[PDB]
Amino acid sequence: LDKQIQELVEAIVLPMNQPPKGVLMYGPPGTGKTLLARACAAQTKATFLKLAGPQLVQGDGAKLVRDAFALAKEKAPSIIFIDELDAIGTKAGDREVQRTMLELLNQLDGFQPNTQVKVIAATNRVDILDPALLRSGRLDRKIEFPMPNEEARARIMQIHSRKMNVSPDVNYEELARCTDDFNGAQCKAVCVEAGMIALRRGATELTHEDYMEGILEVQ
Amino acid sequence: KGCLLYGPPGTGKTLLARAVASQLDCNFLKVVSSSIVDKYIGESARLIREMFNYARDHQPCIIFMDEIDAIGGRADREIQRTLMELLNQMDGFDTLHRVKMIMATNRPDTLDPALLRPGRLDRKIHIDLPNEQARLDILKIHAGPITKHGEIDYEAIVKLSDGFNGADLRNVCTEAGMFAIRADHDFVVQEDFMKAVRKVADSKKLESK
Amino acid sequence: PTVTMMQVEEKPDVTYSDVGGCKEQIEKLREVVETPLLHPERFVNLGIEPPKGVLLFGPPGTGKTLCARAVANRTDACFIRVIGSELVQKYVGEGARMVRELFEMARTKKACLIFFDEIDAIGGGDNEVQRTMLELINQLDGFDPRGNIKVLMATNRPDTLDPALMRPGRLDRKIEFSLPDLEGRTHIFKIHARSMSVERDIRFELLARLCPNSTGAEIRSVCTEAGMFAIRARRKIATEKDFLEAVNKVIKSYAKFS
């Protein structure tokens, strides 16, 4: 899971620090692509402008496209991360979102000043994919996700548990071994669950046995 | 007002219809075969009347149909209902003038011989396999607008390409040009052509189903 | 408008020991309403992103009593309780200015605490509700009003999918209804001994053991038919032998079908 976070961090940082324009971040569920791209946003440090799938469906989706590209035109080089694009781009409202889609590709095709702020796209499945997305300005980086391991779960749980007051005795192998058949948000239930009883325990610093005590507590 | 492009041995209809449809096309409107499976209540009849109604309200109109082999069974009840709307709206009493539609397929066995009737499908062109010489010439006439380094060698690109798609040949070769443009070099060496064409082309062999 | 001066809630109400029998959960929801109020800097210095509040859902039971408890435990300046019926109304566009003017009053009232009642009325076509709940969560997750004061959702159904997927980021400390044991009801009895003339001959442990599965709603109905049948019997003092038929009637005749 390092060559694709390197490919993503390059895809969105080498133009930030012809540069790439579009990225299609897909893969099987259970990985945490939204918090993996948000963990990437924690390394870019730029403004993270969230946008969901059905936000275009409210002739308003084209107004949100021209709004995100007006903030892309004038606003500082932030990080616009859209998600769930296959659900709204189902190839009479869906045809209106196909007009919004063809306006999106027309603005990613006929506009030369598109070297400014980019847009990160994420989908949960690539069965519904527009064949007209083959362009440098359009979605180019198509990456598939491998199955995560306990080491990668210690990586994302360490990026998500690096700022809190954790005692410096964590082998990561007891907790990495105990976290079986889990996902990113469930490891967030593990670490947040370890942060739950931090008040009533009295010790303001998180300890070692509270991770496995959260695993055995809620899961 | 109708035509068929069946290329069972080989491919190459995507570079043609995408070359002219990307050139002028007089319009732009694509109809994909995945908007008909209708997982919900099968009300796709009024979707055909509405979408084709707009396709006839607009005077310039060209419609493409890709991957019709799975939706061309000889679940199938609503398929044959929309095919009855295709009969009554291809050879019916309607305003069936200049507006044009194009069908594409893979196998000439489940091609709905009711739809294979003239009128519903006037013309048919049997595309052949992309030959190694044809791959070389198509790579030379498609190698024009793309930039390359002075060191060129088409023998490795054409040689390492065996049983590939022509549309995937152009999108994988230009995909390798966009792979080499990452480091914003005006000159494009063929090392990244071998690398990205080889790896991404093998990914199109994994996804060549 | 009228909701500005009407929204400010005064005249305090039901206290602490009316809790429906929760011994640990009353700490799980007390350590966020009473403990952060004693000092702001304490939980700010406790680390990263101090907890806003808790989450109440499930069966109604003793609902609206623990919120009245939160209003009672206010030591300095009587607080408020946003109701859910004010956001979803006719003539859309006033709920946004409403929530922004009450959050602006939260900014004006030196970090005032806010409570949200009946979230199911604005939770879950519904685009006019999507303005109130998506703009509502857009203002809660926003750092403009405040990010430490108070969150508390009191509702009947947790079936609000969008708040269920937007809550784990900001909202925390979800608890169940925590129905009491046999010994829990005698606390509600000892605090509601101000009710309509509970005679000293009435034993609270007897009344507690004479009613199983009698959570705060059902013993609140024990008090409702207690004072009601105390008024209707032309009596002035209440005696356990005089209204035990109303007790086992209000729990058994109402526990047959339900």
UniProtKB/Swiss-Prot annotation, chain A:
Modification note: Sumoylated by UBE2I in response to MEKK1-mediated stimuli.
Binding of ATP, residues: 27-34
Location(s), subcellular: Cytoplasm; Nucleus
Residues with the Phosphoserine modification: 167
Family membership noted in the UniProt record: Belongs to the AAA ATPase family.
Subunit structure and binding partners: Component of the 19S proteasome regulatory particle complex. The 26S proteasome consists of a 20S core particle (CP) and two 19S regulatory subunits (RP). The regulatory particle is made of a lid composed of 9 subunits, a base containing 6 ATPases including PSMC3 and few additional components. Interacts with PAAF1. (Microbial infection) Interacts with HIV-1 Tat.
Chain's role: Component of the 26S proteasome, a multiprotein complex involved in the ATP-dependent degradation of ubiquitinated proteins. This complex plays a key role in the maintenance of protein homeostasis by removing misfolded or damaged proteins, which could impair cellular functions, and by removing proteins whose functions are no longer required. Therefore, the proteasome participates in numerous cellular processes, including cell cycle progression, apoptosis, or DNA damage repair.
Disease: Deafness, cataract, impaired intellectual development, and polyneuropathy: An autosomal recessive disease characterized by early onset of deafness, cataract, severe developmental delay, and severely impaired intellectual development. Patients later develop polyneuropathy of the lower extremities, associated with depigmentation of the hair in that area.
The name this protein goes by in its record: 26S proteasome regulatory subunit 6A
Chain's gene name: PSMC3
Shown residues in whole-protein numbering: 191 to 428 of 439
UniProtKB/Swiss-Prot annotation, chain B:
Gene Ontology molecular function terms on file: ATP binding; ATP hydrolysis activity; identical protein binding; proteasome-activating activity; protein-macromolecule adaptor activity
UniProt keyword annotation of ATP-binding present: yes
Subcellular location: Cytoplasm; Nucleus
Keywords of the record: Acetylation, ATP-binding, Cytoplasm, Nucleotide-binding, Nucleus, Phosphoprotein, Proteasome
Residues noted as binding ATP in the record, renumbered to the chain: 7-14
Modified residues (N6-acetyllysine): 39
GO CC aspect terms: cytosol; cytosolic proteasome complex; extracellular exosome; inclusion body; membrane; nucleoplasm; nucleus; proteasome accessory complex
GO BP, one annotated term: positive regulation of proteasomal protein catabolic process
Protein function: Component of the 26S proteasome, a multiprotein complex involved in the ATP-dependent degradation of ubiquitinated proteins. This complex plays a key role in the maintenance of protein homeostasis by removing misfolded or damaged proteins, which could impair cellular functions, and by removing proteins whose functions are no longer required. Therefore, the proteasome participates in numerous cellular processes, including cell cycle progression, apoptosis, or DNA damage repair.
Subunit structure: Component of the 19S proteasome regulatory particle complex. The 26S proteasome consists of a 20S core particle (CP) and two 19S regulatory subunits (RP). The regulatory particle is made of a lid composed of 9 subunits, a base containing 6 ATPases including PSMC6 and few additional components. Interacts with PAAF1.
Protein family per UniProt: Belongs to the AAA ATPase family.
UniProt name for this protein: 26S proteasome regulatory subunit 10B
Curated annotation (Swiss-Prot), chain C:
Modification after translation (UniProt): Monoubiquitinated by RNF181. Phosphorylated. Dephosphorylated by UBLCP1 which impairs PSMC2 ATPase activity and disrupts 26S proteasome assembly.
Nucleotide-binding in keyword set: yes
Origin superkingdom: Eukaryota
Biological process per Gene Ontology, one example term: positive regulation of proteasomal protein catabolic process
Subcellular location: Cytoplasm
Induction / repression: Expression is not cell cycle-dependent and occurs throughout the cell cycle.
Keyword annotations: Acetylation, ATP-binding, Cytoplasm, Nucleotide-binding, Phosphoprotein, Proteasome, Ubl conjugation
Binding annotation for ATP: 58-65
Chief localisation class: cytoplasm
A molecular-function term among this protein's GO annotations: ATP hydrolysis activity
Any Gene Ontology CC annotation: cytosol
Entry keyword annotation includes Cytoplasm: yes
Chain positions found as N6-acetyllysine: 256
Record function comment: Component of the 26S proteasome, a multiprotein complex involved in the ATP-dependent degradation of ubiquitinated proteins. This complex plays a key role in the maintenance of protein homeostasis by removing misfolded or damaged proteins, which could impair cellular functions, and by removing proteins whose functions are no longer required. Therefore, the proteasome participates in numerous cellular processes, including cell cycle progression, apoptosis, or DNA damage repair.
Family under the similarity heading: Belongs to the AAA ATPase family.
Description of how the protein assembles with itself and partners: Component of the 19S proteasome regulatory particle complex. The 26S proteasome consists of a 20S core particle (CP) and two 19S regulatory subunits (RP). The regulatory particle is made of a lid composed of 9 subunits, a base containing 6 ATPases including PSMC2 and few additional components. Interacts with NDC80/HEC; this interaction is detected only during M phase. Interacts and SQSTM1. Interacts with PAAF1. Directly interacts with TRIM5.
Protein name: 26S proteasome regulatory subunit 7
Organism of origin: Homo sapiens
